[PDB]
Scaffold this active site. Sequence first.
Site, PDB file in Angstrom:
ATOM      1  CD  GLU A 265       0.043  -3.003   5.026  1.00  0.00           C
ATOM      2  OE1 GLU A 265       1.269  -3.071   5.501  1.00  0.00           O
ATOM      3  OE2 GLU A 265      -0.292  -2.137   4.223  1.00  0.00           O
TER       4      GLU A 265
ATOM      5  CD  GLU B  84       1.808   1.144   7.049  1.00  0.00           C
ATOM      6  OE1 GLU B  84       0.943   0.449   6.516  1.00  0.00           O
ATOM      7  OE2 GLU B  84       3.123   0.908   6.882  1.00  0.00           O
TER       8      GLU B  84
HETATM    9  C1  LIG Z   1       3.543  -0.113   5.911  1.00  0.00           C
HETATM   10  C2  LIG Z   1       4.162  -1.285   6.659  1.00  0.00           C
HETATM   11  O1  LIG Z   1       3.229  -1.833   7.574  1.00  0.00           O
HETATM   12  C3  LIG Z   1       5.445  -0.902   7.388  1.00  0.00           C
HETATM   13  O2  LIG Z   1       6.012  -2.055   7.957  1.00  0.00           O
HETATM   14  C4  LIG Z   1       6.485  -0.335   6.398  1.00  0.00           C
HETATM   15  O3  LIG Z   1       7.665   0.091   7.088  1.00  0.00           O
HETATM   16  C5  LIG Z   1       5.858   0.896   5.755  1.00  0.00           C
HETATM   17  C6  LIG Z   1       6.828   1.694   4.888  1.00  0.00           C
HETATM   18  O4  LIG Z   1       7.201   0.861   3.794  1.00  0.00           O
HETATM   19  P1  LIG Z   1       8.646   1.028   3.155  1.00  0.00           P
HETATM   20  O5  LIG Z   1       9.692   1.070   4.190  1.00  0.00           O
HETATM   21  O6  LIG Z   1       8.689  -0.022   2.102  1.00  0.00           O
HETATM   22  O7  LIG Z   1       8.668   2.374   2.575  1.00  0.00           O
HETATM   23  C7  LIG Z   1       4.567   0.547   5.014  1.00  0.00           C
HETATM   24  O8  LIG Z   1       4.816  -0.284   3.872  1.00  0.00           O
HETATM   25 CL   LIG Z   2      -4.007  -6.402   3.371  1.00  0.00          CL
END
Ligand SMILES: *[C@@H]1[C@H](O)[C@@H](O)[C@H](O)[C@@H](COP(=O)(O)O)[C@H]1O
Ligand SMILES: [Cl-]
Length: 463
Positions: free
Chosen positions: A165, A366
């Site tokens: 991301e 994910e």
């Molecule tokens: C997706 C992201 O890639 C991951 O690293 C995050 O832990 C999760 C969950 O987010 P939060 O802990 O903010 O809930 C996704 O954002």
């Molecule tokens: Cl992205």
Amino acid sequence: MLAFPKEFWWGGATSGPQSEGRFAKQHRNLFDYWYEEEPDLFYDYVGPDTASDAYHQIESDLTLLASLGHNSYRTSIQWTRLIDDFEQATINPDGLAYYNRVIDACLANGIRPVINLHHFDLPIALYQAYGGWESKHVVDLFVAFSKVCFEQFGDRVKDWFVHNEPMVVVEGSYLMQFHYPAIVDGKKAVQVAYNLALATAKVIQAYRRGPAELSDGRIGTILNLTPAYPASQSEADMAAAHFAELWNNDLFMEAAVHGKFPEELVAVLKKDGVLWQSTPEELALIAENRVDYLGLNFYHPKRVKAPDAIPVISPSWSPEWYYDPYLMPGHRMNVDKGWEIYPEAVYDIAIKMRDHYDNIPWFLSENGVGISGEDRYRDETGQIQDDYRIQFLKEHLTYLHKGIEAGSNCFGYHVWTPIDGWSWLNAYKNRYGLVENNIHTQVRRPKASAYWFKKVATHNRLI
Ligand SMILES: *[C@@H]1[C@H](O)[C@@H](O)[C@H](O)[C@@H](COP(=O)(O)O)[C@H]1O
Ligand SMILES: [Cl-]
């Protein structure tokens, strides 16, 4: 009753920073640094020094995940662990031995290792020295890191991803204040976005130039294709959704898959005075070095409307000049998190891949749901009865199945997250695991959803 394709990937996703701990890690990443400086920004003051102790427990973890039916596991390699001298990409010998342990334990358990190269973890020294992703020299040092990874591990890892991301890095670091350096600077954000996309293409080039026995697998990136659902069908709300898609989805998707930036987005950025600096050679590298496949992340929907206010001046460029977040009356919601639950969006993503991105291969990389106070749901035996998580996963999977039946070329599903991990500023406030972690003892205990997902993965079907 809902059968999945043969050789469908089943497992879950984590990252080096959220699982490993800083045990024997030579350098600080942005989040390690941030926690050192401002611990009280982090829930219960838990930083990443230990996280979920994967530095020590990766072998026993993969053994457990194998026993719970997983055939694949996505994590990330930390630039800050593998590399000693960033400018020369020399190798830290303990980091190399560490990632060799991870990968060999994967294969010994019959788990396909799926490796990401960047998950919000730029080295702080590269931020301080050069502006981080703002620098094209830094991009070159990232490439040199990627080459170490491919040379050292590519005999055994055949499934590679350049970023998780990248628009979240752009937003976190340069727009919305949730990654370090947490500044607000649109001109920088836009250049960072170009530089991340260019890095994607350069890493892909580097992968494909490696020796044939190290370069026979696939390389992609992990992106969001979450729809920006318009608040209404008014012209204004549609144009808001339109622009929100251009920025949040199209920029990185068009570059990854078609090797071009979207022309309409480019005209907006230029009109607003914030267009990235590029060269013709860089643009041709991007056109020539596109993904084999994608990971697509989905864990909540987004809705938008026409902006409620048009400022006579803004402090900095933002994509939110053209839209505001919208809350839909009657939406289904996860109260702990403040997030809408809308699994139908998975089908919409699947249809988009089918019709707009040449149906190239992709997997849902994910997908999960995070809840606090899971103590409250333990039964007589001490196992967390997370039927809310079973239900959430089941619905999203039902719509993924619908998308595969409609022709979308999806080859897998990874739950966020196999074992409770450290989520950045929220640390362990909200638990996403199929398997509980006690954060004081690092003892694991499968939740009910682990046994449910075991069934699904092993029988290759739902219901
Ligand atoms: C997706 C992201 O890639 C991951 O690293 C995050 O832990 C999760 C969950 O987010 P939060 O802990 O903010 O809930 C996704 O954002
Ligand atoms: Cl992205």
